[PDB]
Write a protein that binds this ligand. Sequence first.
Ligand SMILES: [Cl-]
Ligand SMILES: [Zn+2]
Length: 186
Amino acid sequence: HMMMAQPVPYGKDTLNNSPLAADGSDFPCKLRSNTYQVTEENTAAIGQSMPLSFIGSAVHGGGSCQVSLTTDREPTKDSKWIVIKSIEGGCPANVDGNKFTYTIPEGIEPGKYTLAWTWFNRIGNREMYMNCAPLTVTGNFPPMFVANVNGCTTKEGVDIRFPNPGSIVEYAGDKSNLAAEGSQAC
Ligand SMILES: [Cl-]
Ligand SMILES: [Zn+2]
């Protein structure tokens, strides 16, 4: 189980490392008392490299992640999300024990957004992790992939390839675990 530490999520004080509820009842962003409370506003310039980091008790052999944006500062199940980065394999890490960035690309207008990190764990229960953060962008993108909370279930043991990964894709896992190009993810 993991949670995002950078960028700083909304409602950090009540954010836990549990995945989204399987029935979709807390999608998006782990709906709770203070889901969209700004703990710390995160700020990024277009083209600026920004840190993405995580804390928790198990990386579940990694998996695959997206970084997505919505103009909604209080997203609902009907919000439109656009992917700015996909990481296929090796996210959030490969092993447990005692690395990633994203950039706001050209084509994103300055303004206020919600940023989401989503993670599909390679090993264990068929889960979707999601944490959301307030992002201010100072001054070609596909819809975010959703599975495991919507009746679409992924396959255990594989680093999934997103159907629509977008043009910014990093591979950080073991090639032997990476799903085939064009494979059905769920
Ligand atoms: Cl860990
Ligand atoms: Zn876990």
